[PDB]
Design a protein around this ligand. Structure first.
Ligand SMILES: CC(=O)SCCNC(=O)CCNC(=O)[C@H](O)C(C)(C)COP(=O)(O)OP(=O)(O)OC[C@H]1O[C@@H](n2cnc3c(N)ncnc32)[C@H](O)[C@@H]1OP(=O)(O)O
Ligand SMILES: CC(=O)SCCNC(=O)CCNC(=O)[C@H](O)C(C)(C)COP(=O)(O)OP(=O)(O)OC[C@H]1O[C@@H](n2cnc3c(N)ncnc32)[C@H](O)[C@@H]1OP(=O)(O)O
Length: 288
């Protein structure tokens, strides 16, 4: 008890950042996946103190942080060193964040949990599973030779706003506020391109590509609902993969949000593996 210490902090400094990364690595290796910590958000000063660091004789063994992204909720990331689990560390860390979230007119807190780790007991105490977030990677240097579909592909320009806004409205319905200007931001940023898939003369799908020097990231893949289930999505992803490989990139990444595990088979079939996976559970503060 003498060496147990909790510091409430508005922003982590160099020290506190490097300790958090160490704890993250130990959790990552022990559990396979880690919650989202948003390391860029932690170097940044905020109105209330936002991170709760748990030390035992100077060593960081526990961490809780709270995040304010949208109006109705607060995202909570919690990490305890595997050595020190089930000793109350996480519970104590919650009590420190509570008075602060009541200072913000928030009563709903959402936890990011490594996939498969905590399913049985988040059920028991009333947590509501919401959705899952997967970061996937394909290290295979061999291209995808297989999906011959009646599709042609072209790169999107600023004249493709209506196509891109229409595709996003029906494939990402609870998301698209001011898509016009979001796609305008994307198409004005050199690191991004958007592939449009065409079935005859109809655009039926799109995929975003964020290029880096040695990799590229696919995101916001969409196929018109009436055209799904015909292999067009797999053909579009494979086209982006072969495009990425032909530019000498050694890796394709992919961010995807799902509500069940079955939806990932699609990406497994194309050579992706899970690098990180989190399920987002919910609860109001009333249920302690
Ligand atoms: C309540 C939360 O911890 S938030 C869930 C968010 N998920 C994550 O953070 C996953 C990250 N991966 C990890 O391994 C994490 O470090 C953790 C959550 C396992 C570490 O948490 P701990 O410090 O070991 O939990 P702690 O000892 O403080 O107990 C907290 C409560 O959750 C329960 N609990 C903790 N771990 C488990 C577990 N593996 N299985 C079942 N119940 C558990 C405890 O019984 C306790 O419940 P109670 O107060 O009603 O008796
Ligand atoms: C940031 C992000 O979230 S982007 C990732 C996309 N997430 C979304 O929410 C977008 C939803 N919008 C959509 O248009 C679609 O639902 C998409 C993009 C998910 C997939 O589009 P589709 O054209 O329906 O995919 P496709 O027809 O190629 O494959 C469907 C199924 O058949 C399988 N399949 C298709 N073709 C083959 C084939 N030749 N051989 C073997 N299996 C095949 C796939 O494995 C897949 O399996 P699953 O549904 O059980 O996971």
């Amino acid at each position: 008890p003498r060496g147990s210490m909790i510091t409430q902090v508005n922003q982590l400094d160099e020290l506190q950042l490097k300790d958090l990364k160490t704890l993250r690595a130990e959790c990552k290796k022990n559990d396979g996946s880690i919650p989202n910590l948003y390391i860029h958000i932690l170097k940044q000063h905020r109105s209330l103190p936002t991170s709760f660091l748990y030390y035992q004789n100077g060593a960081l063994i526990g961490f809780l942080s709270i995040y304010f992204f949208y109006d109705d909720a607060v995202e909570v990331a919690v990490l305890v060193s595997p050595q020190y689990r089930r000793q109350g560390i996480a519970k104590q860390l919650i009590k420190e964040a509570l008075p602060l979230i009541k200072s913000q007119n928030y009563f709903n807190l959402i936890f990011s949990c490594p996939s498969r780790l905590n399913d049985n007991w988040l059920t028991s105490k009333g947590f509501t599973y919401l959705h899952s977030e997967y970061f996937m990677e394909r290290d295979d240097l061999n291209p995808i030779l297989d999906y011959i579909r009646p599709l042609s592909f072209r790169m999107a320009t600023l004249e493709d706003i209506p196509i891109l806004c229409g595709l996003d409205e029906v494939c990402f319905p609870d998301k698209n506020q001011d898509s016009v200007h979001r796609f305008q931001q994307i198409l004005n940023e050199r690191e991004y391109e958007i592939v449009i898939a065409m079935l005859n003369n109809h655009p039926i799908g799109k995929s975003h590509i964020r290029w880096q020097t040695k990799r590229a990231t696919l995101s916001d893949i969409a196929i018109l609902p009436k055209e799904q289930g015909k292999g067009f999505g797999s053909a579009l992803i494979a086209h982006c993969i072969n495009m990425i490989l032909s530019e000498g990139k050694s890796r394709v990444d992919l961010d995807v949000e799902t509500h069940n595990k079955k939806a990932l088979n699609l990406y497994i079939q194309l050579g992706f593996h899970i690098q990180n996976a989190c399920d987002y559970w919910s609860i109001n503060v009333n249920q302690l």
